[PDB]
């Protein structure tokens, strides 16, 4: 096997990113970092959500984006979203710092290398 561990390096990269950028982020028990810029007026595991998210690497290059609202089931998404989206209501925005083990894993996919820290700027517009 070629099993690779990225938790420690992802953790140190995330804390360095929060050091260079004047940002304070709360940490979950699974290693996810999140920032609530604003709160609205909570999605569950079986809940449909519409998001205006934006995803990029630590160097700022965008790998995925949705300028208009896109509907998701919130149970088919990466674990980082499954932990971050329930933290706010409709209209709120969250900044995610998903590590690899909560994102695309140690192998990644196309356009996302394995063991890559993901950054998401997600706006929850509806929990329909």
């Amino acid at each position: 096997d070629e099993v690779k561990d990225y938790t420690a390096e992802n953790e140190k990269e995330i804390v360095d990113y929060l050091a260079q950028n004047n940002l304070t982020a709360q940490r979950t028990n699974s290693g996810l970092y999140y920032i609530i810029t604003k709160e609205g007026s909570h999605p569950t595991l079986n809940s449909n959500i519409t998001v205006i998210y934006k995803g990029y690497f630590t160097n700022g290059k965008v790998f995925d984006e949705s300028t208009e609202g896109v509907s998701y089931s919130l149970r088919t998404l990466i674990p980082g979203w499954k932990e971050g989206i329930p933290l706010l209501k409709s209209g709120g925005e969250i900044q995610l710092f998903v590590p690899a083990h909560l994102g695309y894993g140690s192998n990644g996919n196309k356009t996302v290398p394995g063991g890559a820290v993901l950054i998401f700027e997600i706006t929850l517009v509806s929990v329909n």
Partner: peptide, 15 residues
Amino acid sequence: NRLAEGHYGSGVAIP
């Protein structure tokens, strides 16, 4: 299990 170890690289407990 092998695929999960490839995807979750043994750094966390496999969900």
